């Protein structure tokens, strides 16, 4: 179990810096290299660069010199930082260890980064109420940012026939997104449902009891 | 920088069959290496130095070429394999990934299942009318979804987000959301929603009238 892990900001404002550090295990940094990679809201993926076990560096002159890696190897610890954000340095952000055929076998699970100057807000959460053997509810997440809300129905104990689909980012600058989930509609009567919202950036958790009108 | 060309950038698959995805590099390079993504969680290696399995990746996988041509293939597709599949060279700086091949699983006709929600209550104490629409469970992903309210067709007030194709059932749902201020919310009646889809003999209408 090699495992490595991402910590960073979330938010960023334009022209300041981003620092990430990725935290390992099961392997020695002294030993093995670190590369990192990203994956802007719906696009491919772009390599940024690599600290060696030796602690030389390679990077992607596309960042035109913004990205310094380094590295302390007792602490565990890969550094980047990258100056002078803009809008178009928003993306996923993972560090990697390359491994067989020095392809990154192992993979961080990403850290989010968001470049605006716009400020935290937690989302309003409404219920979209079942109708009068199926039946459909849900609730309605709104007026949040930055990305992500996690939502889970009776604190994941109800999964199937969920639906959680994507925020859209609108005009305003704020997300929104809907969960359905379908059921019997012999429940209705019986069954508690219960939509439970969180939002890490604002330290906001929201459950919200969904029943018929 | 070496730039690596996946193409096509969309294909389907049914199940069973045999599906091919090429990688073409500008440059040659000696080795080839894939990865997986499934719905924009971390990729996995999947196959590495052109033709080497990676740990995990079942044996209907393989990888083959040489020079400037390479390519992935599926003996037979199933339904865990719709995802992305980048290729990557690391032969020389930048080290760089094509821009993916997704895959989808076509599968049998599905007619949506289709919902509509009036806007909450407590909603409307804030000002703000979110009438939704849902479609659920239905393949293929083309649909046509129109707001109607009092006969009219609403434009430019309505955003429709989609579901990747689920993981057991590969099918599609789909929301749509109007948005209206309350007044103008309470200055009509009929709100409907109308479904076509190739699922559907005809449209699917689905409404409400506001009060109850
Ligand atoms: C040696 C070298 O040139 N490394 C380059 C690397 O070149 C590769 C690469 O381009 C690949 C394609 O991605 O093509 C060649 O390698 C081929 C295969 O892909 C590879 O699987 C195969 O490996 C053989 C292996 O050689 C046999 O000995 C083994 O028995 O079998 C396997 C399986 O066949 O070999 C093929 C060719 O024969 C190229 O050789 O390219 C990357 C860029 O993607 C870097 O440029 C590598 O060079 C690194 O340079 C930095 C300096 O800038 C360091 O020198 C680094 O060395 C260390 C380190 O400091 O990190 C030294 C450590 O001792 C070593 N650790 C251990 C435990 O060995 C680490 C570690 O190897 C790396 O961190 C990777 O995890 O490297 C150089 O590696």
């Known amino acids: 179990q090699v495992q490595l892990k991402e910590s960073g900001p979330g938010l960023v404002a334009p022209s300041q810096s981003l620092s990430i550090t990725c935290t390992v295990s099961?392997?020695?940094?002294?030993?093995?290299?670190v590369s990192w990679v990203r994956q802007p809201p719906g696009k491919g993926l772009e390599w940024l660069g690599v600290?060696?076990?030796?602690?030389?560096?390679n990077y992607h002159s596309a960042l035109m010199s913004r990205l310094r890696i380094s590295k302390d190897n007792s602490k565990r610890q890969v550094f980047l930082k990258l100056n002078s954000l803009q809008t178009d340095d928003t993306a996923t952000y993972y560090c990697?260890?390359?491994?067989?055929?020095?392809?990154?076998?192992?993979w961080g699970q990403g850290t989010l980064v968001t470049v605006s100057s716009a400020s935290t807000k937690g989302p309003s959460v409404f219920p979209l109420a079942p109708s009068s053997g199926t039946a459909a509810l849900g609730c309605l997440v709104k007026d949040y940012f930055p990305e992500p809300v996690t939502v889970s129905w009776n604190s994941g104990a109800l999964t199937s026939g969920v639906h959680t689909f994507p925020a859209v980012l609108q005009s305003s600058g704020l997300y929104s997104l809907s969960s359905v989930v379908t059921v019997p509609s012999s429940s209705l009567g019986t069954q508690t449902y219960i939509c439970n919202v969180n939002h890490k950036p604002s330290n906001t958790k929201v459950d919200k009891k969904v029943e018929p009108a | 920088e070496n730039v690596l060309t996946q193409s096509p950038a969309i294909m389907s698959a049914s199940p069973g069959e045999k599906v091919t995805m090429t990688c073409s590099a500008s440059?040659?390079?000696?080795?080839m290496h894939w990865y997986q993504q499934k719905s924009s969680t971390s990729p996995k290696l999947w196959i590495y130095?052109?033709?080497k399995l990676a740990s995990g990746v079942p044996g209907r996988f393989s990888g083959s070429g040489s020079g400037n041509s390479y390519s992935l293939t599926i003996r037979t597709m199933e339904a865990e394999d719709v995802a992305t599949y980048f290729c990557?060279?690391?032969?020389?700086?930048?080290?760089?990934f094509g821009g993916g091949t997704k895959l989808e699983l076509k599968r049998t006709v599905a007619a949506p299942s289709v919902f509509i929600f009036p806007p909450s209550d407590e909603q409307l104490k804030s000002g703000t009318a979110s009438v939704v629409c849902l479609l659920n469970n239905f393949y293929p992903r083309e649909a046509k979804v129109q707001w109607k309210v009092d006969n009219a067709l609403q434009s430019g007030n309505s955003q429709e987000s989609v579901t990747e194709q689920d993981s057991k059932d590969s099918t599609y749902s789909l929301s749509s959301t109007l948005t209206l201020s309350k007044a103008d919310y309470e200055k009509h009646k009929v709100y409907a929603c109308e479904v076509t889809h190739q699922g559907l003999s005809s449209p699917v209408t689905k409404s409400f009238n506001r009060g109850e």
């Open positions: 990697t260890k390359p491994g067989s055929g020095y392809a990154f076998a192992y």
């Open positions: 990557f060279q690391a032969s020389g700086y930048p080290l760089t």
């Open positions: 130095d052109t033709s």
């Open positions: 600290i060696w076990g030796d602690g030389s560096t």
């Open positions: 099961g392997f020695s940094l002294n030993s093995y290299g």
């Open positions: 440059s040659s390079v000696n080795y």
